Amino acid sequence: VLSPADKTNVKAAWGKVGAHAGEYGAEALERMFLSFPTTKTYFPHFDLSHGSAQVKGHGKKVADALTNAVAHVDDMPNALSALSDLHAHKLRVDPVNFKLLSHCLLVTLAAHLPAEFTPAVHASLDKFLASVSTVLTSKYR
Amino acid sequence: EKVVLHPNYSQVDIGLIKLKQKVSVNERVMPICLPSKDYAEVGRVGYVSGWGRNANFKFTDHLKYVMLPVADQDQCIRHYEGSTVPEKKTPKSPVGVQPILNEHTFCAGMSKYQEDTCYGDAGSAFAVHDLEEDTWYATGILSFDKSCAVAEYGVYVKVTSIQDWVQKTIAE
Amino acid sequence: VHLTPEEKSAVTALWGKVNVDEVGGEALGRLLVVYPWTQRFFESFGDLSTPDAVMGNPKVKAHGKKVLGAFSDGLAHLDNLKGTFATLSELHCDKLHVDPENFRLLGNVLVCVLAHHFGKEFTPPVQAAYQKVVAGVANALAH
Amino acid sequence: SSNFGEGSGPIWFDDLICNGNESALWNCKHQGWGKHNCDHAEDAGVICSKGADLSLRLVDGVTECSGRLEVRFQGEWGTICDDGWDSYDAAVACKQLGCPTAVTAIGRVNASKGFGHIWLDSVSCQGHEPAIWQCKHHEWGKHYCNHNEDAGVTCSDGSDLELRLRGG
């Protein structure tokens, strides 16, 4: 569960992510595709090569969704209701892929923000990404 | 052999599974006993085994368990619904979906290490160890497993509420 | 699965600059902070409530050094991981009852620590190689 | 919303109709003594003038009317989160400190992060409130802001703002 201190740390970390969110998400998607190729089965229509414009656009969309979740950290299920329905029903993405993407996002943030990825901030960001994944995987069946 | 659902399975998330033949009871297979009392009194710690997903959202290879204490009922409806009064209840679940909360269910919060039950843990008994007679009782059956770590409470349907129905079902 | 020579070279080159005395302690402290149930196995290490207490714990640092040395030992024998980790897996399964998923969690946390330490040098290719490495270590350390 | 914690005991009043000039709370019409369709998460709490002892000040600015905005709540000084902080809030603050309000910018001019508490967040002033705490805002201290987000104002009489292009 996200404590108020954890919410503060997540808000600060994503604020210092700032405008680099789109390419952070693109890098996280690339890391998920390379490290865990089993997640590529959910993108059969995407060009999954390095530096892909389509992967970059999807990473921008993912980071915009994460920004909306951070801004609505107290109402995340309502903020991600459309995405929850989408991932759970239309795409039927298995939650292990969500945890893999959360790990890859954490790796990207650690590689790009080493000064601000403190163990407390790392734990808070992991909790926030777990909350996002749980909201998106809740309706999975 | 057959599966029978609770008649009010929309309010009491229970279904009964009947095997073709009686299983051979040994040190690894043994039925839990249905409680004669209500061990769901707030503060009681029961052991929730589970075959569900883990911190990586991967279905656990080995059986695990947690020692979740039953939480205050009012805190649980207030956590999921709005204000424990029907005219002010709102879908306030920290997770996407809403649990089935009524008089037939209790709630057990996370343990002291912020660990809870995740997807696939539903149907697992809230096993409570009665130290007086050294017997393990299924105080509740985990109904809401979507509380992996975001929602602070997992919802367990009281077995004592369903005890009368299951015993009538064992007869036939 | 066999690890490609390019991936092996990348892993070895990135591990050459790894601070053995600090990276393992950092990874273990991060594991105990992010996943507090892992503090259950280190109740003899003293205070582990505050994240600063976890990261500043001398016993945690020493055990992280030992864990990272075990990672290095498994790295030198990437092609034979079950044989090298048989004794440690038996220890964790029987004497300590550590869930195998904790090994995967520690591998992911170690990958996060390596990325945090090496910045952009932790490229997605070398991260994939290290994910293969930590998956092999965890599988060899499990069951 | 039981921000001061969840109370215990029987809820006494549910729908109090008070116009303001009442000698005591148990004098409004309400709808009964103990009759309520409520929970203990709906316990109402209040903050009073002589207890809060509120005052506003500007710290670490290039002028006595610029820099980081700091508000005192219950005897301890704290900053203001810049979330929801806009020109109307700055105008209200400038008119509250009683110094030029011709142009009221936001953001601390050069001040570093404040120290201590962060009291106000998402202050929603219409521009006419006598002070910054009569505006609609989140509860005192209930936010997820850090001190890098400290709100500030730049009270100027539209005369000492100069712009130019240099180097071309």
Ligand code: HEM
């Ligand atoms: C924190 C985790 C995640 C976030 C924030 C997220 C967010 C998003 C967003 C914003 C979209 C755009 C949908 C639209 O615009 O209609 C999307 C689509 C999609 N997502 Fe995710 N997602 C996450 C996890 C995942 C994972 C792990 C996978 C697969 C392994 C996945 C698979 C997909 C697919 C296949 C689409 C459809 C894109 C397309 O058809 O072009 N999602 N997601």
Ligand code: HEM
């Ligand atoms: C993932 C890779 C891991 C490696 C390579 C590793 C390696 C080691 C090593 C070298 C030892 C010392 C053996 C000895 O002293 O005889 C050890 C012991 C131990 N490990 Fe691990 N470990 C790993 C993961 C974990 C995890 C995830 C946990 C807990 C969540 C854990 C808990 C322990 C404990 C409690 C001990 C004994 C502490 C003591 O002897 O004082 N290990 N491990």
Ligand SMILES: *[C@@H]1O[C@H](CO)[C@@H](O[C@@H]2O[C@H](CO)[C@@H](O)[C@H](O)[C@H]2NC(C)=O)[C@H](O)[C@H]1NC(C)=O
């Ligand atoms: C922001 O700028 C103001 C104005 O320059 C600084 O205040 C001055 O601080 C110096 C000390 O170095 C004093 O000698 C001046 O008298 C101050 N001027 C005024 C108008 O107060 C202030 O220190 C700066 N804040 C920072 C850099 O954090």
Ligand SMILES: *[C@@H]1O[C@H](CO)[C@@H](O)[C@H](O)[C@H]1NC(C)=O
């Ligand atoms: C189902 O609900 C009805 C009324 O709500 C009740 O009479 C009946 O006993 C319930 N079913 C069982 C099996 O208890």
Ligand SMILES: [Ca+2]
């Ligand atoms: Ca009412």
Ligand SMILES: [Ca+2]
């Ligand atoms: Ca802000």
